[model samples]
Target: DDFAYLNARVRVRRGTLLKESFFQEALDLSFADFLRLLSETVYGGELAGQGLPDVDRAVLRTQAKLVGDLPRLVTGEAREAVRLLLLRNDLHNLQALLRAKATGRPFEEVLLLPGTLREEVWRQAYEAQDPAGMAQVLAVPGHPLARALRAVLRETQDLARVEALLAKRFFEDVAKAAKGLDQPALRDYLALEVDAENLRTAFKLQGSGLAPDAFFLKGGRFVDRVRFARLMEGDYAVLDELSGTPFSGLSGVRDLKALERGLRCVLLKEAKKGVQDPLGVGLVLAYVKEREWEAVRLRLLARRAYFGLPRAQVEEEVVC
Candidate 1:
């Protein structure tokens, strides 16, 4: 039988995500009001149970519980697939936080709530004297990405390089896990995401006038050397080549927020496509993606409300 029990639970959780209209309403709220709104949402209840106070802390706690509970709620291959996918989010966040900490920024400001690693380990790593100590504090043993990150801790000049390296490693693991699945659609879904990421990276590098070679990851099936070279060279004419593809037209937006929204839209569309087949892992993944998107939306709105940004500005930042 299909993993219906787990699917049902996930579906209920998915329903707890903020609706699009709620996001629109949030755009108009004051910071305190936004927090009040969140306090009335499903995330609020989850956070209250975790003893989290305030909107930001509540968001983190809710995310942590959702991810931590995922593996326990599922079974067999489906469980394994979700677990692997969830780890990608955690690994990416870990690297992001590490990069922030290395740069003398407050890493906790950007950290996510849930992961395989313990909170104490994260705290110690964040407060550690050196990169080596930070690496050792990670409770999840034998994570290849963490090892690679440790090796690059001293090389703090290039944040993009660090992110690209982590992305490459995570994608490799995803590819290995996706191999030989009965459902090629799920594989295609992930590939499209990687392609979008590469496109965004290329655009960002071009905009920032960084050398293409500086951020190049050793392996990415979607981004070949030749195309990357063209992108690196800032060939606007050749930018059309990305058109009609999954990542097409992202360069139209001059701002990072807009570009990111476009990327999220592309991924959400792909996830919706996967949800058409209910019996496979696609539906489960779709729910996860959708819920995650909702959580991010809520966080963005809450921040805008907290900061007292104008509704127009908030609307501009909210993803569709």
Candidate 2:
């Protein structure tokens, strides 16, 4: 039940994550030079070959290894917490498969494996090829997601609504799981994530003529149904509820990309607090989020190098 040894190991591994200097140096390097720079870091093995494809593969491998390693590093309730974290990938892959099925596009190439649901289950759902068939394939008795999908499928075949339903279900599950965990940092981090999701969803709905209250996820400490409804009605003061918190930057972000970056920063801020409680689940949460950010920044840097995009533009994205 103790996290001393696990958190200690995580502290050591956290040192391997890329620092800001690496990103600054990478912004000006040629694509070849960028690969060479990556070759010297933990991502080198997968980036040994040339091109953006190699960079993408490297990012994927990093994510896969991170997910694979997390569960084994902790036990008891911590294991359950980690499992909840990893299960989102299953939701992501399912959404991607359903979207591909609708558009007649292929999705096999982008799947994240080791989700709580077996890969074959997703493949079977994909092959089923319609809401009813997909529901049948995913109908695991008593599973929250399965129940939500089945219920939603009974009412609508609209892909956007279905996607939103899955997101709502996943966040609700996270909220419930967070409440069950004794680690305060981990619970707070999960709460911040739910709030972030609600914020992003509310921001996107601004000009879409949709009811913001209907899309707000439950269990978020911030951004409840009434707050979201007010946000839609131009009550900017509602943002003060998040003031001085990690989400403060969210107040005036009118651009979607800026809003997204602001959300990422706040989540990063909350996740980093895990380090303060090393004997709890916080350290593990921080390490995982930091490592994921590293991978994301690397991919963005690689794309910038490949396209010879402006260093200023890439730096803005990479620095956060």
Candidate 3:
């Protein structure tokens, strides 16, 4: 496949994207009417299978397909961006395996495949005695992910800390791999995501009186280790500074939708700024990114409608 291949599909796919207008169109529809909105698209049948779990799994498959399909259609830096974007799914599986090893619970039930790890690799890691040993096993002598896990294993085996290290390394891997791209559209989006991650982490750890520095990452746009550390013990002043960003005062479950809206808005805004190449990676990046978000959004929206949740409650929980 050529760059033309990805751009062709991506350009055509915009017709399928959900807009602010779509929300208002469906908001007042009868309870089951949302199914018509879904059925008209690719997610129809699986969406009808009971609740969110059934469809979220379906959505995950689409995400995996988007990741798996792009390398052949896009070359060089664009392909790197696609691969790195989806690698986070693998990290999630890694988190699951380590958590199982730590808690003595079985993980087969929650395992999400089509990530960076093999099933056997995840299984092998899960058989380790503890999180520290899981680190030793995943390390391929000098692999980045393994090194990040092993770096702090002895000091604290907490899954959250391992998760933090993994996240820090994950974004670094993506940024480094995609370094050659004219990535204003994608890279800026990555920074805000990291910023959101740091924000969420600060809120969770601040209550424990823990210093947030060790767990903070380097590449975030609005938040660095110093600011993240300060915010943990500091006050609303930090949020005031970030009010211009999606990270500010992301309260309740509403934060998910708020951030989702902010992320898409930025993505589209940046994609429109330049058109150096007609058959370019920006279109592919925007398409792949939004498609992935669409699956996730479906999971939330489907769950909201399936459960017959109140409009306010759905508004609180569903973020796209």
Candidate 4:
């Protein structure tokens, strides 16, 4: 169908995303007012039906329902192209389940949707309670879950180590899968994602005075190991070659929080390009992602409002 049939529906749904003025309006609202906004938006149906008074849980279930149902909306070649995002969702679920188990927290609190793996799979993995056994149970090589379950044992120093390894593996596999699909927008987005993750990974390792080069993820078009060293050593002129790339402005950032903010801005900016490609991989992929971002954005806003955070503080954290 070349996505002609599906993109129409995708565009209609994306068009409902909270407008700029809406988020701007949301910026000043009280907790009660924020909940009122949720009731009037695309999330209203889920909010009314799910009946969760907790804004966080209500927003999550709504977004999960939206993402979990993508396969039905995206068919044909488009379905395959969208798989990278779907697989990434699965990786997140795996990380959540494993992290919860590791920290003695409830996995239900952290699980996400749009995953190929079912609830029982997460339950079984957690039940096994053995990382080595998980490697066998997952049966998927280079998968973030499988690799992360094993990495937990070796990277026992901290949670960051396990997450970094999992993130690296996830992108490595995403890029490989994208190569097989051969969609330019999809590739472009994934490359920028890999670069963004690499930049953060490199920066964190550098801050720790550790050798970041050894742990660098391999699938990024720009930040392949060669560029990692230069980007780390402050030879940021290389960023100039990355004209129009998502992280081009990132060369100027040095603060951890600022870089994190920059990365989010870059990805959303990159998503803007996808917004223009109505019938390609960009529309469905970006729409689903934007919806997910909105979910997180609303959650943060609600939490900040609940805590009576200063307007300036909420703005910095929301970063929408």
How well does model 4 score by local distance difference test?
0.68
Which rank order by lDDT, best down to worst? 2, 4, 1, 3
- Which residue runs does candidate 4 get wrong by more than 4 Å? 48-53, 92-144, 151-158, 207-213, 224-227, 230-245
TM-score for each candidate, following the candidate numbering: 0.84, 0.82, 0.70, 0.79
Among residues 3 or more apart in sequence or in different chains, the pairs in candidate 2 whose N, CA or C atoms overlap within 3 Å are none
Tens digit of per-residue lDDT, candidate 3, span 1-320: 23666676656656656665555545444436776766665555345464445555555555555444666667776666656655655665676566565677775444453555544556667776766566666774343567667665656666666666667667676667666666565666667667766765665455457767666866678777776776677443555566665555433322324544554555445444433346545566556555655654565566567767667765543343
Identify the runs in model 2 with alpha carbons over 4 angstroms from their true place. Answer: 89-147, 207-212, 233-242
Residues forming the 10-long window of minimal summed lDDT in candidate 1: 46-55
Compute the lDDT of residue 116 as modeled in candidate 3: 52
Candidate 1, residues 194-237, lDDT tens digits: the string is 76667657656665666666555533335555676677567544
**Error at 276, model 2, angstroms:** 4.0
Query: How far in Å is the alpha carbon of 54 misplaced in model 2?
Result: 1.5
lDDT of 3 at 252: 31
Candidate 2 lDDT, tens digit per residue, 59-173?
Answer: 6666666555677877888788777766765676777787778888754444444355655666677888467777778785334567777866776677766676678877776
Q: What alpha-carbon RMSD in Å does predicted model 4 have with respect to the real structure?
A: 4.2
lDDT of each: 0.66, 0.72, 0.59, 0.68
